[PDB]
Design an enzyme around this catalytic site. Structure first.
Site, PDB file in Angstrom:
ATOM      1  N   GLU A  30      29.377   5.285  -7.597  1.00 51.00           N
ATOM      2  CA  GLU A  30      30.255   6.168  -6.842  1.00 51.00           C
ATOM      3  C   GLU A  30      29.637   6.452  -5.489  1.00 51.00           C
ATOM      4  O   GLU A  30      30.342   6.557  -4.475  1.00 51.00           O
ATOM      5  CB  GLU A  30      30.498   7.464  -7.612  1.00 51.00           C
ATOM      6  CG  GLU A  30      31.085   7.255  -8.992  1.00 51.00           C
ATOM      7  CD  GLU A  30      31.478   8.555  -9.658  1.00 51.00           C
ATOM      8  OE1 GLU A  30      32.302   9.294  -9.080  1.00 51.00           O
ATOM      9  OE2 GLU A  30      30.962   8.839 -10.759  1.00 51.00           O
ATOM     10  N   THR A  70       0.661   2.097  14.317  1.00 49.97           N
ATOM     11  CA  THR A  70      -0.550   1.802  13.567  1.00 49.97           C
ATOM     12  C   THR A  70      -1.060   0.386  13.797  1.00 49.97           C
ATOM     13  O   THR A  70      -2.272   0.165  13.730  1.00 49.97           O
ATOM     14  CB  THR A  70      -0.291   2.030  12.065  1.00 49.97           C
ATOM     15  OG1 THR A  70       0.014   3.411  11.846  1.00 49.97           O
ATOM     16  CG2 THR A  70      -1.501   1.679  11.219  1.00 49.97           C
ATOM     17  N   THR A 127       2.471  -8.136   3.926  1.00 52.99           N
ATOM     18  CA  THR A 127       2.953  -8.390   2.572  1.00 52.99           C
ATOM     19  C   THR A 127       4.212  -7.599   2.239  1.00 52.99           C
ATOM     20  O   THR A 127       5.134  -8.151   1.632  1.00 52.99           O
ATOM     21  CB  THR A 127       1.848  -8.131   1.538  1.00 52.99           C
ATOM     22  OG1 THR A 127       2.272  -8.618   0.261  1.00 52.99           O
ATOM     23  CG2 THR A 127       1.494  -6.666   1.411  1.00 52.99           C
ATOM     24  N   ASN A 177       7.223   8.152   9.475  1.00 52.58           N
ATOM     25  CA  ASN A 177       6.147   9.083   9.146  1.00 52.58           C
ATOM     26  C   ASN A 177       6.029  10.221  10.152  1.00 52.58           C
ATOM     27  O   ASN A 177       5.647  11.335   9.781  1.00 52.58           O
ATOM     28  CB  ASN A 177       4.819   8.336   9.042  1.00 52.58           C
ATOM     29  CG  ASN A 177       4.751   7.441   7.828  1.00 52.58           C
ATOM     30  OD1 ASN A 177       5.561   7.556   6.913  1.00 52.58           O
ATOM     31  ND2 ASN A 177       3.772   6.550   7.805  1.00 52.58           N
ATOM     32  N   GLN A 192       0.829  -1.202   0.000  1.00 47.95           N
ATOM     33  CA  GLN A 192       0.000   0.000   0.000  1.00 47.95           C
ATOM     34  C   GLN A 192       0.863   1.250   0.000  1.00 47.95           C
ATOM     35  O   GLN A 192       0.690   2.133  -0.850  1.00 47.95           O
ATOM     36  CB  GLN A 192      -0.964   0.038   1.188  1.00 47.95           C
ATOM     37  CG  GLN A 192      -2.143  -0.911   1.097  1.00 47.95           C
ATOM     38  CD  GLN A 192      -2.641  -1.337   2.463  1.00 47.95           C
ATOM     39  OE1 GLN A 192      -2.368  -0.677   3.462  1.00 47.95           O
ATOM     40  NE2 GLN A 192      -3.374  -2.439   2.515  1.00 47.95           N
ATOM     41  N   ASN A 244       4.225  11.473   0.525  1.00 49.44           N
ATOM     42  CA  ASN A 244       4.621  10.799  -0.701  1.00 49.44           C
ATOM     43  C   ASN A 244       5.219  11.766  -1.715  1.00 49.44           C
ATOM     44  O   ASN A 244       6.165  11.407  -2.426  1.00 49.44           O
ATOM     45  CB  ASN A 244       3.410  10.094  -1.302  1.00 49.44           C
ATOM     46  CG  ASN A 244       2.888   8.986  -0.415  1.00 49.44           C
ATOM     47  OD1 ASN A 244       3.509   8.631   0.579  1.00 49.44           O
ATOM     48  ND2 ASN A 244       1.733   8.440  -0.770  1.00 49.44           N
TER      49      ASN A 244
HETATM   50  N1  LIG Z   1       4.333   7.345   4.287  1.00 47.17           N
HETATM   51  C1  LIG Z   1       3.385   6.446   4.055  1.00 47.17           C
HETATM   52  N2  LIG Z   1       3.167   5.429   4.954  1.00 47.17           N
HETATM   53  C2  LIG Z   1       2.204   4.509   4.726  1.00 47.17           C
HETATM   54  C3  LIG Z   1       1.424   4.583   3.589  1.00 47.17           C
HETATM   55  N3  LIG Z   1       0.555   3.552   3.614  1.00 47.17           N
HETATM   56  C4  LIG Z   1       0.767   2.835   4.738  1.00 47.17           C
HETATM   57  N4  LIG Z   1       1.783   3.421   5.439  1.00 47.17           N
HETATM   58  C5  LIG Z   1       2.357   2.976   6.721  1.00 47.17           C
HETATM   59  O1  LIG Z   1       2.940   1.691   6.612  1.00 47.17           O
HETATM   60  C6  LIG Z   1       2.504   0.854   7.662  1.00 47.17           C
HETATM   61  C7  LIG Z   1       1.466  -0.128   7.155  1.00 47.17           C
HETATM   62  O2  LIG Z   1       2.038  -0.955   6.174  1.00 47.17           O
HETATM   63  P1  LIG Z   1       1.105  -1.440   4.964  1.00 47.17           P
HETATM   64  O3  LIG Z   1       1.625  -0.927   3.646  1.00 47.17           O
HETATM   65  O4  LIG Z   1      -0.306  -0.989   5.220  1.00 47.17           O
HETATM   66  O5  LIG Z   1       1.193  -3.037   4.996  1.00 47.17           O
HETATM   67  P2  LIG Z   1       0.820  -3.877   3.685  1.00 47.17           P
HETATM   68  O6  LIG Z   1       1.951  -3.762   2.700  1.00 47.17           O
HETATM   69  O7  LIG Z   1      -0.474  -3.400   3.088  1.00 47.17           O
HETATM   70  O8  LIG Z   1       0.689  -5.384   4.225  1.00 47.17           O
HETATM   71  P3  LIG Z   1      -0.743  -6.088   4.416  1.00 47.17           P
HETATM   72  O9  LIG Z   1      -1.516  -5.378   5.497  1.00 47.17           O
HETATM   73  O10 LIG Z   1      -0.547  -7.531   4.797  1.00 47.17           O
HETATM   74  O11 LIG Z   1      -1.495  -6.023   3.113  1.00 47.17           O
HETATM   75  C8  LIG Z   1       1.899   1.781   8.694  1.00 47.17           C
HETATM   76  O12 LIG Z   1       2.900   2.281   9.544  1.00 47.17           O
HETATM   77  C9  LIG Z   1       1.345   2.898   7.845  1.00 47.17           C
HETATM   78  O13 LIG Z   1       1.341   4.100   8.572  1.00 47.17           O
HETATM   79  C10 LIG Z   1       1.639   5.606   2.680  1.00 47.17           C
HETATM   80  O14 LIG Z   1       0.955   5.681   1.666  1.00 47.17           O
HETATM   81  N5  LIG Z   1       2.621   6.537   2.916  1.00 47.17           N
HETATM   82 MG   LIG Z   2      -2.486  -4.351   2.513  1.00 44.96          MG
END
Ligand SMILES: Nc1nc2c(ncn2[C@@H]2O[C@H](COP(=O)(O)OP(=O)(O)OP(=O)(O)O)[C@@H](O)[C@H]2O)c(=O)[nH]1
Ligand SMILES: [Mg+2]
Ligand SMILES: Nc1nc2c(ncn2[C@@H]2O[C@H](COP(=O)(O)OP(=O)(O)OP(=O)(O)O)[C@@H](O)[C@H]2O)c(=O)[nH]1
Ligand SMILES: Nc1nc2c(ncn2[C@@H]2O[C@H](COP(=O)(O)OP(=O)(O)O)[C@@H](O)[C@H]2O)c(=O)[nH]1
Ligand SMILES: [Mg+2]
Lengths: 442, 74, 79, 78, 48, 52, 430, 442
Positions: free
Chosen positions: H253, H178, H144, H205, H10, H227
């Protein structure tokens, strides 16, 4: 120059209908057999000659026979759109099918029809001056395709002798299935194809379904899509005979380069730009990309993975706007790959062909229009895995003699099951032995 | 001053970008469902990433092409 | 022009509000007739049924080219 | 060996394309083939008050803490 | 340098406009709430 | 396949067979060869120096 | 990713009718079954709860079971009743009599094969199946007995999926049924072995919500079932609409359940406030968090101050900043630190979804795993022991065929559950 | 020249949307993949080639894959505005998530999806002629991202060998959190990130939220702001490949100068002119001012204080109107400060890069328009405090086996927790030891 196509049974006639649709549209022959006066082909030109002959009034007629035991499919051809194209003698039909029995086709019913087929084929062969082989389309899963195809190949091999016979065969899919008795017909079939064919190309409907779902964007494919893909492949292989090119490839070159030993004649086939129009405009299509495509197992038209074996020879046919430097760079890149392996006794693994005529596009939504294409035929030990699944299904059925009384009643000895299963077992052992590294110098 | 105009003579003129229906190019139209009359439909039904994809290349949200209420944006 | 017209504000209608807790003007316990129906038995015996109408749209596609139109159109011995 | 990169025979599971690698594995972690599916079993005969449910005798699932995936012929990643 | 200065000026003006628009938007959200509140009160009085 | 150049009335733009190639690439290549032969006979060193 | 719903007994069928009204409204399906929505976002996930019938129409993937068709006869003639598939209504010929043994053993085994056939027919049509969802009361007769029977059969047949229940539980002050302790104890024994996650709601808390918070003059069960349908539709909202931080039933279970027996949860829903007060306070994330932990908005009689939170989850719907959510959850954990179990470093999971329920700018649903639930089980075990020592009504159950040993097993299992909660409450780092 | 981007889950896909919007707007490619046909600048420059390839139809398409286990985010990309930019094969989506379990991603679910990912990466790497690394974006807090990111990095590391892998990683914030199970996933992740990455950039974050509140004037930030900042950082690091400059810096480098020992590869990142349009008119923004800015801890994008450690190497990337003499004067001013300390074995602490292309301004963006910017990546012993809070939280939670039954049910031995915790303990001791003065010569 000329080649004659023989279509047997249901799959072979329907694929023939799709093929002749394609060859007509690529040359420009009208479905009435004429040629419109506004085209710039010219009356003098000869490229059609590989597939059509003129009676002298300028009508075209094709070098083919359609053979079936049931009337319905040939009567469908007779009442369709190409009714006036074919000579009525060419469309031969019996009364009733071989009912999924190889024995019924071979012994009981095909024996009546076979002499008519030979008289028409003779009438074709007398009207030729450079016949250079037979192309045969049939399925080994059904009764008439197996029985009459075997009987006819035996008779052709006695009567015509040295003339080459190249087969395209629809084999029983490894888990998609249509009839219960498919293993028996395919085992009994493979003995005749082993003895009476010079090169045999293997096809599986499950692979062409996978290719049309995965590569094309078709949710609801039907046999016409598969048959159009097969027609494109045959047009690609025979294009080397019909148009000018940098590196031509005569049909004898396929057999000379691809077959190392006289029994080792079962080959894998693949075609590169099977792609939808929306994907085709998302991607560049250089020579090296389509050359890389023909080696992925996702591209194959037979359900086998070549990574479980070793290649002995590859023959690569390029058609369209291609330059030799791209063919050489592609072949050198393939040779570099670590997941592609050749037997150590075959150092010069490749044959190349280069033709200037790009592939024709047939109206509809099954292929993009493209300036170049490559088609591959390759010999590999991986094919032994394809036979093994049929043998397992045969052993499962034969352990209980599940259906044998039908075959014995229609005229066959029980011994023939054991004979055929041992011969195909010997074919597996041949593929095991040929793939064994030369460790005799130690 | 915009929030609480009061009785001031020097009121701030409207910018002309904000509208109830959310579109500066199309008038109000009756919805298909009767219970959706009072809702601001073009603003509720849009994902955040789609909003930043559509509005990203414009300094101001009223310059963006209309949403269109379609699965691929019009 | 962008605001809601006054025909929907100056009336008294309960269908304009979405269902929620506290929106209980049109429900049971307030109906004049509170008899219990025997619909299931009658339905399973096959002498009453519901069957609402469907919707079908027959518009033709627009912007088709010459070749597409020709494709749509595609699908006595005298000298 | 099962066929590679196939689109048949794994309905109802989480897989999209089955067995791209061409190894000896099941198409998916969830059972592609089960004892009974839409035909069902007999449940009227199998319920008796004299063979009632005992303490700590519930069905063993992944949420309880039992590795169900080890009982099937699915290759895990090493 | 002159072109850069003009670009910066127009950017600042447009950001000020956007900052005005958000404050303009919140009151329309409030109006959306108000309409439903009024209709609910009227219906309750009729039922009584 | 349509032709690269527009204003081509020939519907089969790319039909390069044996007969088509001989009867179309004979005259054009022969014309280019004879143009090269006759056009290079009158060499002018002064004009070449001027172009350089 | 499709959910199959089961509605059992009177409470379940009545709550189900309002739930399917709310769901049909959210996806813009007319009460005739015709799609009439106004954005593709409504259409693009309709498959989650509806199957598509020909020329426009959608049909809801639900099985209705009851022993007498009276409730089902009412819902069918109800305003949305036509949407339901006729073949999905299963009924017997004599009532459960509010008796668990009758509902489980005599008419249960008689009907159960047709219910399993319908559930299997519905399950095998999905391309990928998510958990089952069941609504029933534990104090009743057919709800408790047939719900737990069906749950046991589905857990045998689908052990790799999720098992979720919504359940109504007896008030601490007034009983609706005399034999409630037996049915409750046996049902909790069945759930604690079979279930993956169970939510509990007290009718007394819904009555107090209606009278104290909303100040309704003449509340009806339609309002209580609307509150339940609101929380039920909120937990699943991230499954079926886009958002900045997606969530799923399995991820909720993984973050909420520390140990497999501890799967009983408290529920709350935050934006509740009377029409007179609503003019005085605008919606905002601090306001939602304050209401969310405000006992006026919580749906159980037990109070958190007598226990400690192991874990909690908050699902937010609406267009809002993630920063405000994160700092609110941190501030609540820091200010009330004694009520959170200290050997877990962060007890709250957050999730954010773009699409609010119609006519609200924003909403949150709260799920809490709190040890004060042990007081309910202790009270039920006390009332069970009072009745069982004196054989107060036991002849009905024994006459149906139950062994008395079943009652002692269920009592022992509940007592061990209470002990396990008490032990984890008083654990320490040392 | 070329670089390939891999986006996972995500956070990685959402950061990808901001990255590709920016890279399109910087090169001038329209969202539909076609450059403006009337925009004849005069010389069609090659700079796009780092990020785009042409389809031969003249469309540009980007060198990226989007990887997810849940459909929703990739289907959102498929239905958005940039539908035509991406090739549909590049957007890969599974059916169901890894449910916050590293074990589920690594053992159970990612094993099914990984071979499609490898086939896409193969198709990308074949369409290159000077590939010089992979950029990877993922979060280690989710199931994931951790499990499939580790599995995919392992497979890439076996197949590609020496090719570089640079990671941008979202780490668990020190008190904002989170999900409950974050410590387990981060501990299990760090072994793979230790073995299978060449440089790893760490992000929190909470730091970017503090930066957006303090420097920008945004009261209620959301992930799109973060982002866009990350996209700016990546564009700054890759700008040295794409535009003319005085002192170019190839990624090798970077790797040669920044990494002293093969395990010591975790780096801090910061960016200087984060400023609003209204602030921009009160201050000049000279080279020395932004160079002074990158060293204040208020500028960092990771929650660590570098005053609690020692710098080993710094790499400073300047883009825009800068002259080398001003860079030298700035670096000479930094060296005088007493609160900035370098390990005594690293006397020549700085690497410089200077590029002429100023940073691009995005219409909806929140950053001001500025003539110059500097970006810093630095390696420092201060990171040891960052590991210590995860180890303490893991020890607190693991002492009671708080959630382990999920991991054991999804396929993991309980022993794996202790192994990973001991490996991270040894990495912590390495960072303690490297910072110890060489008092051996006394
Ligand atoms: N900076 C930033 N952090 C994010 C973003 N999306 C999720 N996070 C952070 O990443 C962590 C969550 O990881 P996820 O990406 O939701 O986990 P996942 O890859 O979806 O794994 P699954 O839940 O099993 O599908 C938390 O700390 C969120 O705050 C984003 O778009 N930008
Ligand atoms: Mg997910
Ligand atoms: N690709 C392709 N496969 C076909 C086609 N028609 C049938 N098949 C396949 O071939 C097998 C059936 O063989 P048939 O050709 O029907 O057998 P037959 O030759 O008619 O033999 P009889 O039934 O005795 O008349 C099945 O596996 C079918 O899936 C076709 O038109 N195209
Ligand atoms: N909240 C709510 N509770 C209900 C409803 N109907 C019944 N109940 C409660 O559920 C319990 C009765 O269980 P019941 O559904 O009659 O069991 P059954 O006879 O097996 O169907 C009592 O506590 C009732 O107060 C309803 O519509 N809403
Ligand atoms: Mg037939």
């Amino acid at each position: 120059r000329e080649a004659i196509c023989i279509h047997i049974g249901q799959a072979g006639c329907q694929v023939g209908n799709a093929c002749w649709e394609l060859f007509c549209l690529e040359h420009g022959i009208q479905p009435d057999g004429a040629m419109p006066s506004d085209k710039t082909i010219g009356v003098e030109d000869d490229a059609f000659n590989t597939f059509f002959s003129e009676t002298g009034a300028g009508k075209h007629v094709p070098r083919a026979v359609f053979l079936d035991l049931e009337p319905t499919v040939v009567d469908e051809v007779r009442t369709g759109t190409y009714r006036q194209l074919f000579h009525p003698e060419q469309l031969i039909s019996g009364k009733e099918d071989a009912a999924n029995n190889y024995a019924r086709g071979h012994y009981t019913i095909g024996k009546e029809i076979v002499d008519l087929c030979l008289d028409r084929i003779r009438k074709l062969a007398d009207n030729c001056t450079g016949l250079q082989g037979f192309l045969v389309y049939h399925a080994v899963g059904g009764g008439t395709g197996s029985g009459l195809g075997a009987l006819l190949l035996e008779r052709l091999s006695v009567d015509y002798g040295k003339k080459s016979k190249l087969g395209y065969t629809v084999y029983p899919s490894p888990q998609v299935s249509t009839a219960v008795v498919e293993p028996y017909n395919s085992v009994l079939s493979t003995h005749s194809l082993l003895e009476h064919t010079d090169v045999a190309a293997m096809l599986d409907n499950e692979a062409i379904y996978d290719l049309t779902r995965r590569n094309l964007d078709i949710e609801r494919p039907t046999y016409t899509n598969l048959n159009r893909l097969i027609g494109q492949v045959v047009s690609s292989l025979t294009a080397s005979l019909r148009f000018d090119g940098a590196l031509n490839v005569d049909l004898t070159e396929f057999q000379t380069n691809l077959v190392p030993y006289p029994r080792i004649h079962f080959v894998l086939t693949s075609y590169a730009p099977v792609i939808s129009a929306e994907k085709a405009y998302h991607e560049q299509l250089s020579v090296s990309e389509i050359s890389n495509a023909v080696f992925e197992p996702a591209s194959m038209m037979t359900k086998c993975d070549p990574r479980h074996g070793k290649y002995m020879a590859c023959c690569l046919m390029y058609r369209g706007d291609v330059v030799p430097k791209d063919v050489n760079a592609a072949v050198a890149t393939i040779k570099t790959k670590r997941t592609i392996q050749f037997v150590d006794w075959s150092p010069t693994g490749f044959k190349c062909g280069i033709n200037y005529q790009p592939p024709t596009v047939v109206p509809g939504g099954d292929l993009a229009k493209v300036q170049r294409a490559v088609c591959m035929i390759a010999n590999s030990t991986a094919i032994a895995e394809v036979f093994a699944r049929i043998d397992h299904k045969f052993d499962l059925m034969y352990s209980k003699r599940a259906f044998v009384h039908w075959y014995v009643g229609e005229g066959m000895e029980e011994g023939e099951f054991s004979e055929a299963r041992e011969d195909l077992a010997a074919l597996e052992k041949d593929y095991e032995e040929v793939g064994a590294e030369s460790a005799d110098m130690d | 001053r915009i929030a609480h105009p009061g009785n001031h003579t020097d009121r701030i003129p409207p910018t002309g970008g904000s509208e109830y229906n959310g579109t500066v190019t199309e008038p109000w139209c009756a919805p298909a469902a009767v219970d959706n009359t009072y809702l601001r439909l073009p603003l509720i039904y849009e994902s955040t990433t789609h909003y930043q994809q559509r509005t990203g290349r414009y300094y101001t949200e009223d310059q963006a092409p209309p949403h269109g209420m379609s699965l691929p944006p019009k | 022009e962008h605001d809601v017209p006054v025909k929907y504000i100056r009336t008294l209608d309960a269908r304009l509000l979405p269902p929620r807790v506290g929106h209980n003007w049109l429900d049971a316990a307030f109906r004049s007739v509170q008899g219990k129906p025997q619909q299931l038995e009658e339905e399973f015996r096959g002498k009453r049924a519901f069957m609402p109408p469907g919707v079908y749209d027959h518009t033709p596609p627009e912007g088709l080219g010459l070749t597409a139109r020709q494709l749509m159109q595609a699908l006595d011995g005298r000298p | 060996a099962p066929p590679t990169a196939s689109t048949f025979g794994f309905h109802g599971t989480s897989a999209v394309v089955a067995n791209v690698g061409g190894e000896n594995t099941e198409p998916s972690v969830h059972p592609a083939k089960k004892p009974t599916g839409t035909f069902g079993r007999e449940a009227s005969s199998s319920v008796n008050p004299s063979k009632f449910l005992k303490k700590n005798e519930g069905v063993g699932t992944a949420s309880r803490g039992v590795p169900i995936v080890d009982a099937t012929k699915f290759v895990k990643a090493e | 340098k002159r072109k850069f200065l003009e670009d910066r000026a127009r950017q600042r003006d447009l950001l000020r406009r956007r900052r005005f628009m958000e404050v303009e938007e919140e009151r329309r959200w409030a109006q959306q709430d108000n309409l439903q509140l009024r209709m609910a009160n009227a219906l309750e009085r009729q039922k009584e | 396949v349509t032709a690269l150049d527009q204003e081509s009335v020939g519907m089969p733009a790319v039909y390069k067979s044996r007969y088509n190639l001989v009867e179309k690439e004979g005259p054009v290549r022969r014309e280019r060869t004879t143009l090269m032969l006759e056009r290079g006979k009158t060499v002018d060193k002064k004009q070449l120096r001027d172009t350089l | 990713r499709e959910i199959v719903c089961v509605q059992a007994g009177q409470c379940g069928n009545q709550i189900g009718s309002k739930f399917w009204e709310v769901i049909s409204d959210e996806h813009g399906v007319d009460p005739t079954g015709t799609y009439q929505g106004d954005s593709d976002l409504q259409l693009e996930r309709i498959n989650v709860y509806f199957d598509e019938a020909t020329g426009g129409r959608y049909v809801p993937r639900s099985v209705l079971i009851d022993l007498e068709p009276g409730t089902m006869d009412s819902v069918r003639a109800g305003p949305y009743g036509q949407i339901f598939r006729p073949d999905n209504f299963i009924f017997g010929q004599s009532g459960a009599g509010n008796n668990w043994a009758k509902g489980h053993y005599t008419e249960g085994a008689e009907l159960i094969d047709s219910v399993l056939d319908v559930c299997c027919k519905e399950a095998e049509s999905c391309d990928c199946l998510q958990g089952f969802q069941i609504c029933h009361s534990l104090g009743g007769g057919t709800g408790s007995g047939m719900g737990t029977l069906l749950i046991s059969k589905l857990r045998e047949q689908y052990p790799d999926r999720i098992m979720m229940t919504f359940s109504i539980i007896p008030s601490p002050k007034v009983s609706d049924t005399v034999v409630e302790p037996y049915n409750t104890t046996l049902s909790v024994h069945q759930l604690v072995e079979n279930s993956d996650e169970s939510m509990c709601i007290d009718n007394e808390a819904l009555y107090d919500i209606c009278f104290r918070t909303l100040k309704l003059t003449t509340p009806t069960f339609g309002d209580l079932n609307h509150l339940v349908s609101a929380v039920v539709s909120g937990v699943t909202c991230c499954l079926r609409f886009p958002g900045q931080l997606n969530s799923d039933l399995r991820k909720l279970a993984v973050n909420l359940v520390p140990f497999p027996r501890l799967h009983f949860f408290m529920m709350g829903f935050a934006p509740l406030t009377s029409r007179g007060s609503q003019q005085y306070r605008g919606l905002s994330v601090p306001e939602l968090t304050q209401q969310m932990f405000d006992a006026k908005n919580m749906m159980q009689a037990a109070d958190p101050r007598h226990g400690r939170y192991l874990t909690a989850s908050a699902l937010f719907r609406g267009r809002m900043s993630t920063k405000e959510v994160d700092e609110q959850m941190l501030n609540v954990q820091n200010k009330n630190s004694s009520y959170f179990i200290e050997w877990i470093p962060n007890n709250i999971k957050s999730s954010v979804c773009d699409i609010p329920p119609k006519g609200l700018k924003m909403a949150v649903t709260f799920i809490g795993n709190n040890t004060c639930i042990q007081e309910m089980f202790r009270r039920v075990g006390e009332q069970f022991t009072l009745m069982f020592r004196r054989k107060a009504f036991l002849h009905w159950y024994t006459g149906e065929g139950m062994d008395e040993m079943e009652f002692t097993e269920a009592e022992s299992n509940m007592n061990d559950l209470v002990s396990e909660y008490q032990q984890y409450q008083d654990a320490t780092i040392e």
